[PDB]
């Protein structure tokens, strides 16, 4: 709304989790730069009093900061003039059983803001709007039902008078949908499902008119056998982007359910799809399915980054996105035209390549998955070569700094029944480091990319996956947190590490920045968890446990322990 716009246009404020409507996750604040970053020190810190993974990052509205925890999803409001005083706090009362249907740790990716309200959700499915100054609950509505395996983890997204919110639960057969609510009253405006009838999916009359070969009408059911689409997944629990001029919001729908591909023949549209939908009606102008008939859990929910750059010398309105499947996509955000589809790392082998003309992955049967067969050395693994991390874009050098994962896998599915409220995975995996790390053990990378060509500029390897993402600040710095507990700052020119601080626990969110009384501050959550930390968090030791993540990250607990809080830095 107008109020959110006011904050977005306030220098040093941070009212949106992804850094702005285009989700470039960057900042013009340049007080901290390459020459003085070595002098950055901790300013203050704040514990949430909660353990488990602490994803996302705090919001800063005016002189107030809002911090959020993992389940039970607590909110803490602080006035920057005195970080020692909790102005107001909201501590939800939720059934412990809520945690039992959360696939990948009891994480929360953050708060949103609009119309003078902090927009927050709870894992148990509630969405609330609280007065930003007093914490008073203006409205509280139900969005997801944990009894059928549906929960809330992603950050809400505010645009105009609308709050976009999507449920999680594809691992439990939840049929995905982006739900839209009135920012002032919490009333349901509409919801656009990821599978089913065109009416339920909300497709515009000219859906994909610019690219009919992507598929248009009737595919939400025709690319499934029978009613399998009813428990077909496609949940969107990642991030959104919005272009005010086009009045289009963008996001990616998740993986189809179950993981057992043999149980769901068909392209399974419209799961794993990049969308361009009208904000007012939710009607899709265009939709591109990145991974037809998923066989690897490449949940297509990753960040959408909108930029305006010259493509072969021609200024073009773009949307860029690095999918779990290891492909960096750049499309024209107005019509959905496919411009770039390149592998973020040569290890990607599920596809020989993505054909720009047919618009689909040229699949390599050797790395497919199927019943009564154990696929081996498949890259990327289900954790993807990119997950929930929020990356940053430098508008000057026109570079995206991507936090990647370098993890591959073995995979064999198996038959299982669907029972609402119970998990519906159907596959056993083994995950391990990809083949290209310097010592073949590295599972993380910070890799800079030109989004118009998909070509890398440089790479910095990390022992563990770069799960949280990166933040770019005009001083020429790439900030990011590591699973082993460090907040780091790199020279955006070559990836050279210029500064670091050992936080209490690994970070799984992306850094944010803001200004207060003439000083630039960098904030990062800490508290390891999420999918990578399930072994440590839930005391698991079986290598195949945690959907196969336990074995891959068995060494993480030798570098970090759980935590929950925020650390702020400045000069």
């Amino acid at each position: 709304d107008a109020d959110l716009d006011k904050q977005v246009n306030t220098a040093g404020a941070w009212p949106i989790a992804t850094g702005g409507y285009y989700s470039q996750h960057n900042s013009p604040l340049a007080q901290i730069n390459k020459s003085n970053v070595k002098n950055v020190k901790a300013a203050w810190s704040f514990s949430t009093g909660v353990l488990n993974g602490h994803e996302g990052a705090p919001l800063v509205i005016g002189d107030m900061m809002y911090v959020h925890s993992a389940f039970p999803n607590n909110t803490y409001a602080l006035n920057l003039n005195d970080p020692g005083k909790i102005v107001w706090q909201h501590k939800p009362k939720q059934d412990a059983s809520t945690k039992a249907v959360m696939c990948c740790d009891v994480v929360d990716r953050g708060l949103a803001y609009g119309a003078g309200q902090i927009v927050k959700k709870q894992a148990n499915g509630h969405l609330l709007a609280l007065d930003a100054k007093t914490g008073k609950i203006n409205w509280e509505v139900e969005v997801c039902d944990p009894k059928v395996g549906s929960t809330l983890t992603q950050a809400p997204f505010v645009a105009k008078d609308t709050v976009l919110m999507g449920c999680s639960g594809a691992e439990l057969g939840v049929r995905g949908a982006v739900n839209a609510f009135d920012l002032k009253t919490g009333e349901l405006k509409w919801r656009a499902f990821a599978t089913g009838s065109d009416d339920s999916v909300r497709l515009a009359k000219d859906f994909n008119s610019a690219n009919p070969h992507y598929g248009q009408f009737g595919l939400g059911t025709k690319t499934w056998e029978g009613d399998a689409w009813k428990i077909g997944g496609g949940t969107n629990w990642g991030w959104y982007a919005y272009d005010p001029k086009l009045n289009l919001f963008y996001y990616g729908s998740g993986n189809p359910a179950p993981w057992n591909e043999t149980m769901r023949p068909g392209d399974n549209k419209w799961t794993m799809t990049i969308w361009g939908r009208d904000l007012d009606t939710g009607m899709a102008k265009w939709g591109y399915q990145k991974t037809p008939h998923d066989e690897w859990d490449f949940a297509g929910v990753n960040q959408m980054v909108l930029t305006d750059q010259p493509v072969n010398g021609k200024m073009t309105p773009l949307l860029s996105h690095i999918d779990r499947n290891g492909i960096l996509y750049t499309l024209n955000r107005e019509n959905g035209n496919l411009i770039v589809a390149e592998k973020v790392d040569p290890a990607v082998n599920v596809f020989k390549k993505v054909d720009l003309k047919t618009g689909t992955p040229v699949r390599d049967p050797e790395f497919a998955t199927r019943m009564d067969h154990k696929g081996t050395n498949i890259c990327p693994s289900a954790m993807g070569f990119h997950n929930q991390g929020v990356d940053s874009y430098d508008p000057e050098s026109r570079t995206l700094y991507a936090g990647l994962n370098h993890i591959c896998m073995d995979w064999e599915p198996f038959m299982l029944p669907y029972r609402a409220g119970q998990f519906f995975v159907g596959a056993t995996l083994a995950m391990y480091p990809g083949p290209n790390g310097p010592t073949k053990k590295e599972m993380g990378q910070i890799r800079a990319f030109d989004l118009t060509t998909g070509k890398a500029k440089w790479t910095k390897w990390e022992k563990f996956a770069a799960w949280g993402g990166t933040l770019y600040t005009k001083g020429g710095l790439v900030w990011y947190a590591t699973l082993d507990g460090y907040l780091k700052a790199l020279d955006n020119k070559d990836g050279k590490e210029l500064w670091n601080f050992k936080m209490p626990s690994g970070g799984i969110g992306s850094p944010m920045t803001y200004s207060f009384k003439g000083k630039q501050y960098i904030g990062s959550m800490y508290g390891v968890g999420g999918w990578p930390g399930v072994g440590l968090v839930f005391d698991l030791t079986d290598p195949s446990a945690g959907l196969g993540a336990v074995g891959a990250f068995r060494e993480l607990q030798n570098h970090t322990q759980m935590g929950g809080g925020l650390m702020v830095f400045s000069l």
């Binding site: 609950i137 203006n138 409205w139 509280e140 509505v141 139900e142 039902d145 009894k147 059928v148 549906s150 939840v174 049929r175 009253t185 919490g186 009333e187 349901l188 009919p212 070969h213 992507y214 598929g215 248009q216 595919l219 025709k222 690319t223 056998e225 029978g226 009613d227 399998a228 009813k230 428990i231 043999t262 149980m263 023949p265 068909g266 392209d267 549209k269 399915q289 037809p292 008939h293 054909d355 047919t358 689909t360 992955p361 040229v362 699949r363 390599d364 049967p365 497919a368 199927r370 019943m371 038959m415 029944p417 669907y418 029972r419 609402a420």
Partner: protein, 69 residues
């Protein structure tokens, strides 16, 4: 199955060698129970009704109450 043989635009799925074109009746038949399949829709219907009541009550009373009935 390389994804490049489409029966219709946007519908390029093919059964892999040795696997059926249709799983119903095959050894890979999921045999899903329609009652279970419809549970999400039923839940959403009831949930939407509860929210509608909350919205209506808040509008008429001027105060928002989650537990209204």
């Amino acid at each position: 199955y390389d994804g490049q043989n489409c029966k219709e635009p946007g519908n390029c799925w093919e059964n892999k060698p040795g696997y059926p074109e249709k799983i119903a009746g095959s050894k890979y038949d999921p045999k899903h129970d329609p009652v279970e399949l419809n549970k999400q829709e039923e839940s959403i219907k009831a949930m939407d009704a509860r929210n509608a009541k909350r919205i209506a009550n808040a509008k008429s009373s001027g105060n928002f109450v989650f537990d209204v009935k």
